[PDB]
Design a protein around this nucleic acid. Structure first.
Lengths: 69, 119, 88, 279, 101
RNA sequence: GUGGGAGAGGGUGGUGGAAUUCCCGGAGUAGCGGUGAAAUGCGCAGAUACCGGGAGGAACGCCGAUGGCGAAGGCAGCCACCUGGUCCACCCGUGACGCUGAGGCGCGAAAGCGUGGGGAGCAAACCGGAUUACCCGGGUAGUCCACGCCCUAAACGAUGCGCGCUAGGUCUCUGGGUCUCCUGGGGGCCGAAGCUAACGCGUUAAGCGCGCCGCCUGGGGAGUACGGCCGCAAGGC
RNA sequence: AGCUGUACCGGAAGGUGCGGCUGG
C-alpha cells in the first residue's frame, strides 16, 4: 500500500509528531521513497526536511539495525 | 571457565575472509576463529565452506567454555554470510536473534581507487 | 530587508501626485534605496561575487532611467539628483 | 625488409620493426662506423640493423637476452662473419671485460642499439655510470625522452636525466623517425640520439653523492621556488634554513628561481657551496 | 521582529530544585534579549532514539517566542553555555502545511 | 506598485550523526591483509575480530529523481542572519524610458604558485612485490582553511543575444482560476509545414524573418618564429 | 573505449594524479 493512505490527516512541518513521522521510515531509520510514501514532490521535500530536523532533536533514529537474516 | 552460558557472536564477513568472534553479553570476547585458523590459505579463506568451518569451530570452542545460546550479529557482505549463519544455527547453540550491523559511511572518508567511480 | 514601511515612506515622499507609484522619480528613489542597502552588504561581505552582479544591474537600470529623465525635462533631473545625492 | 619480413616470420611459425631500408643506413651514417670502429649492438632483434651495419662494420658484437630469438640469428646472418653473439644481459654483464677481450684487436667501439624504451634508459645510465672507454652511443629512444636527454635548461624538458648525461657525456637529437614506418603504428614518435663521452666529469667531482642528492632535491617539486624545494626535500634543512639563505647569496643564485631554470655550472657551484658549509 | 520556536533538550536527571533553577535561568536569558513569550509547552521526558551525552533520556522544553531577528544567533550562543542543556534549536515559526485532507 | 510562490542561487556565523585513522583501558590468541592466483607488508614488544573512553581532519548516506537554482563556472546534513535573480495574479502608476555592444571593468572547474596554518582518508613523483603496461603494499607534493596570484578545457546543447510568426501528442517541476478542464513559466521525448550533404532539427528550431556583435578563406609547417602586453614562474593573449 | 586542460615521470612503443566530455 502507501504510507499516506495508511494514515489520517496530519501536518508535514511538525518536527515533534514522532508517532506519525516514524511511519515514513523503513525498518532501518531511512526515509522511504515516494514509491512507498505516496506523496507529491513538494510533500516529499517538506517531509524529508522535517525528518532531518527531528533526527537532530534526537526523536528519530539516524540509523538502526534490521532484525533479519 | 567463564561459564557465561549465554553470549553473542560477531561475524565479520569480508570478500577475502570470514572471522567469527564469540563474546560475553558485556562484549569482551571469549573465543574466536577464522578461515585461516582451520588451515586454508589464500583465496580458499573466502569460500563459503571456509565460513562454515570457521563458524563450527568457534561454536565448538564456545561450548567448551560452557555457552548454551547466543545472539548473532553479522557485519559486512562477504561470500560467507549466509553459510556462516546457517552453520552457527544448527551447531547446537540456540540462536535467538540475527542482526545485520553493516557499518557504512554517511559519505565520509574518500574510498580507495578500486572502490571509487561510484555515482 | 526593506520593510513595507520604508518603501511606502519613500514612495509617498517622491510621488508627483497622490497615488503615484510609477513615475521615474519613484523608480530612481527605490533603486537608490536598494543600491545603498546592497552596497553596505557587499562592503561587509567581500567574497559575495553573486550579489555584485545584482548591484551592477541595479546601477545600470538607475543610470538608464536618469538618462531618460535628463533628456525629457532637465529641471526635474537636477532636482532629483541633488535631493538624492547622486553623483556627488 | 617488408616483403621478406613476412616470409621469415611465417617460415618459423611466428615487436616493432624498421622494415624500411634507407633510414637504417642513415642512423649508422650519423653513427659514423667504419673498418676503424667496432659495434656493440644490444637490440639486434631479427638482425635487420645488423646486416646493413656489418655491410660496413669492423667488428660486430650482439647481445640477445632471450634464446627463443637465438635459433634464427645464425641462419639469418649466415653470410656475415663479423657477428659474435653474447647471450648475456648487458645490465647483469661486465662490459669492461668484453671490451678488453673481443675488441682487443679492433680499434674503437660505438654502441648502436634498437631496443624497447622501458629497457632503454637504465641501460644507457649504466653504460654511463661505470666509465667505460668507448667512443659513443646511438639509440632511438622515444623522442619525448631524447629531448629530455638534451634539454636546454628550460622548456619542460630540463629535468634530472639532462644533468646526469650532460655531466657524463654530450647529447644532441640526431634524427626524427616519422611514425607508421613500423608495421604496427606505435601511436608515438621516436628520435635517434647520439651520446659522445668525455675525458673526466663536465664539472667538479667534489662529491658525486651530494651532487646527485642536491639534483634530486631541487627537482622533487618541479613547480616550486628553489628555496622551498631545499627547505622541504633536503634532509632536515628546516633548522638549516638560514644556512641555505646564506649560501645562496654568495653563489649569486636567487631563492625564488625555480631550480628547473639552473645550469650544470650553477648546480656544481651550489653542490660545492652547501657541502663543507651545511656540515 | 519575527516569531521563533526555541527547543531545549536538557539533563533528565535533575531534581525539582535544579530543574527549577535551570528553567529560571533560561527564562531570564530569554527575557534578556528583548524576547516575548507567546506560549510555553512542557513535554517532560521522552525516549531518545539514540543516546545524547551517554544518557538515553531528555527533558524537553518548547517555547514560542517573538523577538528581534539580529539577536537570535546570540541568544542560541547564550543558551548553549550551561552544561545541563544538551540541545538548543531555534527555528522560524512556519505554517502547518496540510496534506491528505 | 500591491499580494503571494518555488528553489543544492551566494556570503557569514553555529552545531549533528555515520564512517576511516590514531591514542588510552578491558577481554582474548595466532594469524591478519591482499590477488585471477600470489607476493611485499603488519603481527608473540600480542596483530585481526570485540567492547568502552578520548583526539583530529575531511565529506555529508537514506530522501534523490530523466528533479531544482544560477549568466557561465558551478551549487546537496541542519539552524540563524545578511543578500542576488525569477514566476504568477490584480491590470493600479510612468508613457518608447528599447535591443545589441569594438574597447573597458568584473566573475571564471580542475591542475599549478607565494605568504601562514592544517593534515584523517586518498594520492602524481618516488620506494618496494608479483607479472611489458596492468595489478598489490607504502608514500612527498597535492587535496582543506585565510589572504594574494594564475585565467585554461571535450569552459559542450561542439548551437551568440533580443523580438515576432508557423499542426499537434505525451511525461514532468512550479503558480492562478469558473478545478472532467482552462490559462502562465521552466525541463524532457515523438512528430505537421519547412530546413539539411546526410545524420538529424522541428514553438526550448538547425523553419520563416528583422537588428547588433564575434568568427571562417585548403592541409602540414604551427598556436611555432619574431615583436608587443600580462605573470613570481609555469605560461596566457 | 577513447579524447582533453593541467602537473609530474632515472622500467615512456607511453604511464599516472586531479577534474571534464561522449565525439564509446
Amino acid at each position: 500500500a502507501k504510507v499516506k493512505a495508511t494514515l489520517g490527516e496530519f501536518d508535514l512541518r511538525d518536527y515533534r509528531n514522532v508517532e506519525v513521522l516514524k511511519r515514513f521510515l523503513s525498518e532501518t531509520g531511512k526515509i522511504l521513497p515516494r514509491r512507498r510514501t505516496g506523496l507529491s514532490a513538494k510533500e516529499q521535500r517538506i517531509l524529508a526536511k522535517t525528518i532531518k530536523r527531528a533526527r537532530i532533536l534526537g526523536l528519530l533514529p539516524f540509523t538502526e539495525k534490521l532484525v533479519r537474516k | 571457565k567463564r561459564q557465561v552460558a549465554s553470549g553473542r557472536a560477531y561475524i565479520h564477513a569480508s570478500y577475502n575472509n570470514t572471522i567469527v568472534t564469540i563474546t560475553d553479553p558485556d562484549g569482551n570476547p571469549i573465543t574466536w576463529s577464522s578461515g585461516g585458523v582451520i588451515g586454508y590459505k589464500g583465496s580458499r579463506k573466502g569460500t563459503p565452506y571456509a565460513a562454515q568451518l570457521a563458524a563450527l569451530d568457534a561454536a565448538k570452542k564456545a561450548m567448551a567454555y560452557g555457552m548454551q545460546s547466543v545472539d548473532v550479529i553479522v557485519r559486512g557482505t562477504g561470500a560467507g554470510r549466509e553459510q556462516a549463519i546457517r552453520a552457527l544455527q544448527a551447531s547446537g547453540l540456540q540462536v535467538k536473534s540475527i542482526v545485520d550491523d553493516t557499518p557504512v559511511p554517511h559519505n565520509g572518508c574518500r574510498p580507495k581507487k578500486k572502490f571509487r567511480k561510484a555515482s | 530587508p526593506i520593510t513595507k514601511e520604508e518603501k511606502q515612506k519613500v514612495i509617498q515622499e517622491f510621488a508627483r501626485f497622490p497615488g503615484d507609484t510609477g513615475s521615474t522619480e519613484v523608480q530612481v528613489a527605490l533603486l537608490t534605496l536598494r543600491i545603498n542597502r546592497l552596497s553596505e552588504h557587499l562592503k561587509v561581505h567581500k567574497k559575495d561575487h553573486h550579489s555584485h552582479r545584482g548591484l551592477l544591474m541595479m546601477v545600470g537600470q538607475r543610470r538608464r532611467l536618469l538618462r531618460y529623465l535628463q533628456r525629457e525635462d532637465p529641471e526635474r533631473y537636477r532636482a532629483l539628483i541633488e535631493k538624492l545625492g547622486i553623483r556627488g | 625488409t617488408p616483403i621478406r619480413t613476412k616470409e621469415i616470420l611465417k617460415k618459423y611459425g611466428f615487436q616493432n620493426f624498421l622494415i624500411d631500408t634507407n633510414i637504417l643506413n642513415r642512423i649508422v651514417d650519423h653513427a659514423e662506423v667504419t673498418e676503424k670502429t667496432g659495434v656493440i649492438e644490444i637490440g639486434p632483434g631479427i638482425g635487420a640493423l645488423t646486416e646493413q651495419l656489418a655491410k660496413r662494420a669492423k667488428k660486430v658484437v650482439a647481445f640477445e637476452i632471450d634464446q627463443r630469438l637465438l635459433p634464427i640469428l645464425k641462419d639469418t646472418l649466415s653470410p656475415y662473419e663479423n657477428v659474435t653473439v653474447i647471450h648475456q644481459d648487458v645490465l647483469k654483464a661486465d662490459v669492461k671485460s668484453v671490451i678488453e677481450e673481443q675488441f682487443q684487436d679492433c680499434d674503437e667501439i660505438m654502441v648502436v642499439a634498437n631496443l624497447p624504451y622501458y629497457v632503454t634508459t637504465p641501460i644507457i645510465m649504466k653504460l654511463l655510470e661505470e666509465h667505460l672507454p668507448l667512443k659513443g652511443i646511438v639509440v632511438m629512444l622515444q623522442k619525448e625522452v631524447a629531448e629530455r636527454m638534451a634539454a636546454d635548461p628550460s622548456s619542460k624538458e630540463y629535468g634530472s636525466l639532462s644533468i646526469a648525461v650532460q655531466f657524463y657525456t654530450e647529447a644532441k637529437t640526431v634524427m626524427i623517425v616519422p611514425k607508421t614506418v613500423f608495421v604496427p603504428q606505435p601511436n608515438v614518435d621516436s628520435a635517434v640520439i647520439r651520446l659522445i663521452l668525455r675525458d673526466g666529469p663536465a664539472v667538479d667531482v667534489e662529491n658525486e653523492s651530494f651532487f646527485f642528492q642536491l639534483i634530486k632535491a631541487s627537482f622533487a617539486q618541479r613547480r616550486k621556488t628553489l628555496l622551498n624545494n631545499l627547505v622541504n626535500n633536503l634532509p632536515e634543512g628546516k633548522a638549516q634554513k638560514s644556512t641555505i639563505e646564506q649560501v645562496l647569496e654568495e653563489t649569486n643564485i636567487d631563492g625564488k628561481r625555480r631550480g628547473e631554470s639552473l645550469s650544470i655550472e650553477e648546480f656544481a657551484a651550489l653542490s660545492n657551496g652547501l657541502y663543507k658549509a651545511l656540515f | 521582529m519575527r516569531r521563533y520556536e526555541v527547543n531545549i533538550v536538557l539533563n533528565p536527571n535533575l531534581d525539582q530544585s535544579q530543574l527549577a533553577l535551570e528553567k529560571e535561568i533560561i527564562q531570564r536569558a530569554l527575557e534578556n534579549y528583548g524576547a516575548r513569550v507567546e506560549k510555553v509547552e512542557e513535554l517532560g521526558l521522552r525516549r531518545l532514539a539514540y543516546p545524547i551525552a551517554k544518557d538515553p533520556q531528555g527533558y524537553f522544553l518548547w517555547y514560542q517566542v517573538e523577538m528581534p531577528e539580529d539577536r537570535v544567533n546570540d541568544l542560541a550562543r547564550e543558551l548553549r553555555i550551561r552544561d545541563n542543556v544538551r540541545r538548543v534549536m531555534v527555528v522560524k515559526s512556519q505554517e502547518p502545511f496540510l496534506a491528505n485532507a
